[PDB]
Design a protein around this ligand. Structure first.
Ligand SMILES: [Ca+2]
Ligand SMILES: [Ca+2]
Ligand SMILES: [Ca+2]
Ligand SMILES: [Zn+2]
Ligand SMILES: [Zn+2]
Lengths: 377, 376
């Protein structure tokens, strides 16, 4: 079985009685405006996706994840979940109860345990292994406010979720896995439609794992990216036409990527552990500044993670062997070899090209096409 | 990587020894042997049957029957014996005799003992049945009433059209070492490669250094591939689809007994002597179960060659790949199971095998032969 990171699955969803009280006096508490990513962090805290966390890191915890990728008690935790405010936005003090607003929506109530300062260069360097402003995460770290705020939270509202019905929470996914008699579950994280390489990895894992938990991540989109609804419906087509039934589950999680590379891959595994997964597929270049095998290399420092990473050797499609192969068993030259790249396959479709069937399933392509505009913007 | 019994046997007579024995064949009694026995003689003499240096005596014959092991407990499952009738027994114990295939002296033999046997016990213990319809049972009954044990010395081989491909254990071992191979997996066959065969061999290559493909030359039936077709088809396959220094091809001559699981052990022993560390055991290796050939290896933990059993696989015409039921949901019409007999029948009937059954270049190589098949 998979135990929740830290021992118990966290739940911070405020009770209807607690929600009514706080919202009856919104204007008496200090209101702090948060970004959407922080609003998503809050729902991940409240539904146990971030177990054991019950709020935003305090100073001791924050410095510990920076220096060691572990909490003070040595439990693995690699991605700082913090709340920042500028001098002018700090309309509260330690010991105060504050309300975090996304736009005009009260997202959560927070008990301010501690207000502290930090070194943005140290923050940037230890998390992303670089302090170059060109790095997106470094830039977002420098834009942070001067003060971080720690303390336990309680969720009052979620950001509107067009895909609520797919957004199963850890308590539901765990009950579902057991519902299906799965003892081992392998997680596959993605932000793209499935191509044949992704199907190969998932079915490879099925030969020593009971089921696959495909977990599309809902986050900020870039122009040219597949619409989440396209990704969802594409996978539903893939399973119906190519997967045995009761061998896969599709559920979505919301999460704003930090692009901290190998340090973020550990965070990804922790999230999937809490969803109930015992294994986690780690692809190359997970989360320009990080090497392809860096995200696999870091797991050697966490033998106490209690979620088994799965590393796959390099494979490609050969147009002479007519099969997914690897260099050991294929003598064919570069023209015959087709390496899988979701980005290149995505660019074919944007450019009016048909992906060959060794890149994408016929029915998957026709589902993507069934959309007037599959991509954002 | 060590020969069964400890050391590689060699019973090939030196040319000075051979000549002196052939200068006056007059002195020795002549005994006419069947071709299959002549094949057994060259397998003895080139170490394919190590530790055996000749035909088994009584104590060894009975032990193989009862325990599938020699008196010293070394695994040996197939008796290698020489049979003569009362009329053919123009010799006694202690005599030196000459074994002849037609007018060719195949070997010189020192007779240790002449003993009798129970043909029904023989047939039953080896083949698990005494049904005369069983080919091996009938050939056991046609054996002469006397078996003859003793060490042999080979003087000639029956003509071999495939001599150049019939590398002996001492040269295969030197070749495995020359290619830096530490582990070697044997794949025995009597058919052309289809994509299932290639799948298995390349699967093994992911955890062994190289593959030793070993076509077995024996009696043919009407409709069988000619052995030169099989060989040329494999050299076409390797050249077009295998990396260099991952495959070796060599032939061994051997007449099947059809003893099922008991012969699979004997097959693995032969490949051990050739230098292999692993041995692929195909299903149904008539009267025996498909997994029995795999079940028997449990009783031989000391065999020192590792059997390799593979899970069921087939080609799916919707997945467009070799898969297995665990990962494929599609119904029977999309599933193509690999049968060497079905694929061979197609070619005999003038049909083109789909490329998911047989490589394009392999089929073209088979086509290059005007009469690829054996005719009665
Ligand atoms: Ca700042
Ligand atoms: Ca005697
Ligand atoms: Ca008889
Ligand atoms: Zn190839
Ligand atoms: Zn299929």
């Amino acid at each position: 079985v998979s135990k929740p990171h830290g021992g118990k699955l966290v739940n911070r969803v405020a009770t209807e009685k607690t929600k009514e009280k706080i919202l009856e006096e919104q204007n008496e508490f200090s209101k702090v405006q948060i970004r959407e990513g922080t609003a998503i962090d809050l729902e991940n805290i409240a539904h146990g996706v971030y177990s054991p966390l019950t709020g935003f890191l305090r100073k001791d915890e924050f410095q510990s994840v920076l220096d060691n990728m572990r909490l003070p008690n040595e439990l693995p935790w690699s991605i700082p979940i913090v709340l920042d405010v500028t001098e002018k936005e700090k309309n509260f003090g330690e010991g105060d109860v504050i309300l975090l607003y996304y736009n005009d929506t009260p997202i959560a109530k927070m008990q301010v345990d501690e207000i502290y300062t930090y070194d943005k260069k140290e923050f940037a360097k230890k998390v992303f292994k670089t302090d170059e402003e060109a790095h997106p995460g470094v830039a977002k770290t420098y834009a942070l406010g001067e003060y971080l705020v720690g303390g336990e939270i309680e969720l009052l509202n979620e950001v509107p979720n067009p895909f609520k019905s797919h957004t199963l929470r850890p308590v539901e996914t765990r009950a579902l896995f057991k519902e299906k008699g799965w003892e081992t579950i392998v997680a596959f994280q993605t932000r793209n439609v499935p191509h044949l390489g992704h199907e190969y990895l998932q079915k490879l894992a099925l030969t020593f794992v009971d089921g696959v938990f495909v977990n599309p991540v809902i986050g900020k989109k870039k122009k040219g990216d597949y619409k989440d609804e396209v990704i969802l419906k594409a996978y539903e087509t893939l399973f119906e036409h190519y997967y045995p039934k009761d061998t896969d589950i599709l559920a979505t999680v919301r999460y704003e990527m930090r692009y901290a590379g190998p340090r973020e891959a550990i965070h990804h595994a922790i999230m999937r552990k809490n969803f109930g997964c015992t294994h986690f597929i780690v692809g190359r270049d997970h989360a320009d500044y990080y090497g392809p095998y860096e995200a696999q290399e870091i797991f050697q420092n966490f033998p106490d993670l209690e979620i088994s990473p799965i590393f796959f050797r390099e494979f490609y499609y050969c147009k002479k062997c007519n099969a997914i192969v690897h260099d050991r068993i294929c003598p064919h030259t570069s023209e015959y070899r087709e390496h899988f790249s979701g980005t290149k396959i995505r660019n074919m479709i944007v450019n009016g090209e048909l992906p060959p069937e060794y890149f994408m399933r016929k029915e998957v392509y026709e589902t993507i096409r069934s959309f007037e505009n599959p991509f954002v913007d």
